[PDB]
Design a protein around this ligand. Structure first.
Ligand SMILES: CN(CCOc1ccc(C[C@H](Nc2ccccc2C(=O)c2ccccc2)C(=O)O)cc1)c1ccccn1
Lengths: 11, 270
């Protein structure tokens, strides 16, 4: 889950 | 030693880069010690009407048209601000030495549980006993006005103002706060952390750096470190009671969905 946090953490 | 001080300074620079409105700026604004036009004050329904277009809000329709209920419009303003605050905290967290080398799933868990506590730590920087700075310091919403909103919304901010009076009594500065927030993020007791030991080392290291920072910066404030450590648990209680109120709102007020980022953060939290 938490795709949005994982994407916010992957820059 | 010397390296611990270098770590503190690195974190302070990252904090200044990550958070546009600092405690120093906020106090300058709150005490009238800035050259800038003083914030528009929202103390009541009419002042909110006038002041409202100053609230930092980007959506399909202007804030005025979002709801007939004023309390619901304040709800949407606060939600929008919290989303941007979470983005800010995420950037700071990535800047914390060692953070990007943990298992990505641990980074996500730590950010999840940490970010509300960090939001409430920094919100106090924008508060005095009479209200809170909003919209990057261009507005000031009074505590009384927030307390006058109809239930459930009337009880949202009062524990935050109460926490903030005591927390601000510690007279911390931005350099202190950068390390304090880093300490909060790297808590090893968050539910579901898969690999705990590297997190425990980094948090340990941050805690020595914090100790040294307070000894150097506040030589006459005895046991300040202990007092600050005791504040983290308070923050956890604030988050717990806030989540209960949010649950009330979900179960009570027609179509009260939240932004997907906040929904993601609260889902299965504790
Ligand atoms: C008070 N304030 C400054 C920001 O203060 C914050 C105070 C709290 C928060 C945390 C945030 N809380 C909410 C999340 C969704 C909807 C409402 C809230 C409220 O917290 C709330 C509810 C009812 C009445 C008032 C607030 C979170 O959980 O992520 C984030 C920011 C505002 C208010 C309106 C517009 C912009 N700036």
């Amino acid at each position: 889950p938490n795709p949005i946090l994982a994407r916010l953490l992957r820059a | 030693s010397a390296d611990l001080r270098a770590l503190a300074k690195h974190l302070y620079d990252s904090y200044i880069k990550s958070f546009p409105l600092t405690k120093a700026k906020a106090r300058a604004i709150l005490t009238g010690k800035t050259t800038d036009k003083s914030p528009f004050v929202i103390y009541d329904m009419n002042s909110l009407m006038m002041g409202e277009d100053k609230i930092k809000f980007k959506h399909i329709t202007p804030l005025q048209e979002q709801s007939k209920e004023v309390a619901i419009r304040i709800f949407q303003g606060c939600q929008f601000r919290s989303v941007e605050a979470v983005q800010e905290i995420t950037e700071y967290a990535k800047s914390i030495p060692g953070f990007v080398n943990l298992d990505l799933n641990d980074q996500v868990t730590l950010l999840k549980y940490g970010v509300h506590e960090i939001i409430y730590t920094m919100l106090a920087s924008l508060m005095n006993k009479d209200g809170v700075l909003i919209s990057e310091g261009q507005g000031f919403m009074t505590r009384e006005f927030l307390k006058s909103l109809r239930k459930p919304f009337g009880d949202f901010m009062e524990p935050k103002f109460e926490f903030a009076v005591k927390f601000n009594a510690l007279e911390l500065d931005d350099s202190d706060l950068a390390i304090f927030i880093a300490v909060i993020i790297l808590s090893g007791d968050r539910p579901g952390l898969l690999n705990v030991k590297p997190i425990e080392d980094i948090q340990d290291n941050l805690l020595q750096a914090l100790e040294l920072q307070l000894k150097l910066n506040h030589p006459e404030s005895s046991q300040l470190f202990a007092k600050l450590l005791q504040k983290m648990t308070d923050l956890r209680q604030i988050v717990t009671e806030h989540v209960q109120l949010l649950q009330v709102i979900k179960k009570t007020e027609t179509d009260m969905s939240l932004h997907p980022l906040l929904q993601e953060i609260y889902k299965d939290l504790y």
